[PDB]
């Protein structure tokens, strides 16, 4: 997830007289040379946005070199990868008996180790681009490295889900905070709308937990995609509209919230009920409205980004025919 | 990436336990060999991960030459717990204060709440605690006596019955002490008595012991004699361990004491 | 799998100490020395292996200061799991107190405030809530959140100390 961050650092200056001429420009250039494209303080710095504040260029006191140093606090655009994150393009580099290596081709530099034990792996031949999902573990950001260390496997769609029992109302400040995620989802939806609809439908049908019976596209005037199975007589509710109405204090967030596999994970739909009617196989998670909303919004963001990057990477039928081996493997692991 | 200019503003002194030595160590010593041909043997006490003092090879840790390498500590896993030579007296002050059966303090903490922290534990241990009965487990506190034949052996005298407090028994006793007792006795949360017994010692960096000194012979003897102690050794208060194992434990603890506090 | 295994996993942090009983039930052994309580409220530690019957679980709700979160955001290298924990403890967020509140009753009272649970099934509920809380703290969500608030609060402090003042 691309985000902002603020760092502190100390930079050494060999020629203080030359540095003091255009201090802000020299500072930006040296910061870009040192920190851009490297992992530092549990994050990977993408760009240097600016310098919030600095210190006067002091002169080093413990040596007679005459050099200087300056403490700089700067805002940088960084990226942080989380567990269960969906990456739609990694290049298989090494395929040996021990492990499998891949490198992401997206704007999030990360090297991914893959265990050969899992059956979904060991099929991705060297040179194939396979969309993978990061495993339930932390992503290692080793200082000084141009990539991130992570573990994961080829993204096989899951068949289970989680139910959130909400006993707390959504406060105005929490809704205002969540409007940022709502804006992110909106921008992702408008970016998706510019892409090819055929590729969108193909990939959503491919990564559906179930199998779409026939061509039937569901439309909400803000998200367009194929329509799949339902849940008896239960109807889904739009999450974006619910959040917008909650900003005006017009809805109640209490009760059982769920996103069972019959819903398209890249769609803003969700199920809200007054009773635990979902046939889940675990105890419902007691949480506030804000926690459930954060989880669902980030899941929607993840799946929207996954579909968008998958369509970006595979822009022609030649790549699809090349990766039909992976596509059939994905298709096989589906519940009837 | 570059390291910015910095200066030291303050220095903090603490007691290093097993966790500090395990996380600050760059390798674990596992063999008593010294070389494999001309290069240092991997896993020995001269392993190049600890540093380098020869032109032939560079440091494996920082990839520097012997001039720019400051050395890196290693870890030696002791098969039996060992006491800290520098703080043996402190260990005594803790054995006479807390109960040896449940860890609850045998002295009244409220009696020392007005003293300053540096002398709270000293003044608590100065009082007569032998024969005092714990108010929780109802166990009579024995007499903690220092063996006069060495500098690190303790005995418990329960109404004439004498037991030897092996470092494993001392560690089990100390791990039963809560942080509330440590704070209320003037010590800090970084000076818990459980750190006074080491099951993993630090092999100093090669930069501290160049000449791949005579202190390296002590470490090599300590490494070789550590492997004589069985790994699965377990000591429980009251157990009569064989004289073969008891003799080996004495030398290992004495070797480490002479490694740190010889002729001091 | 096993409730004993789950509780042993839950015993690891300094938070959630346990109360021991002589009823001879729910026995478990920690992976390290653990400070526990007993009925009538006496605080005693146990070594890295000691069979302690489990009367109930008391998760302590630690109260920090916003200056601690300010310092940790100033450092900037902390994991989201720790930042969110401190923010919940500093009342900047309430995730810990939201996932908790499976309290049976006022079945056990002492100095520290928190969640006390003393029965069979509600201990299972407590373990489930703790596991879900830490999964949320390590989830993709709460990583966009804690980072957002940590960045924005530091930025606002810098603005009010430089832009709003002189």
Describe what this molecule looks like in 3D:
The complex is a heterotrimer of chains A (336), B (264) and C (166). By secondary structure, chain A is α+β, with helices and mostly antiparallel strands. Chain A contains eight helices and 17 strands. Chain A folds into three domains: 2-79, Dna Ligase, domain 1 (2-Layer Sandwich); 86-154, OB fold (Dihydrolipoamide Acetyltransferase, E2P) (Beta Barrel); 163-332, no CATH class. Helices cover 29% and strands 26% of the residues of chain A. The longest helix of chain A is centred in the last third of the chain and has 25 residues, at 289-313. Chain A is globular. With 264 residues, chain B is an alpha+beta fold. Chain B has two domains: 18-83 and 197-260, DNA Excision Repair, Uvrb, Chain A (Irregular), CATH 4.10.860.120; 85-196, no CATH class. Chain B has seven helices and eight strands, in the order αββββααβββααβαα. In chain B, helix 6 packs antiparallel against helix 7 (243-260). With 166 residues, chain C is an alpha+beta fold. A five-stranded mixed beta sheet of chain C has the order 3-2-1-4-5, covered by helices on one side. Chain C is elongated, with a radius of gyration of 19 Å. The chains are: A alpha+beta (336), B alpha+beta (264), C alpha+beta (166). At the A-C interface, strand 1, helix 3, strand 17 and helix 6 of A face helix 4, helix 5 and helix 6 of C. Chain A: This is D339L. Chain B: Part of the viral DNA-directed RNA polymerase that consists of 8 polII-like subunits (RPB1, RPB2, RPB3, RPB5, RPB6, RPB7, RPB9, RPB10), a capping enzyme and a termination factor. Chain B: This is DNA-directed RNA polymerase subunit.
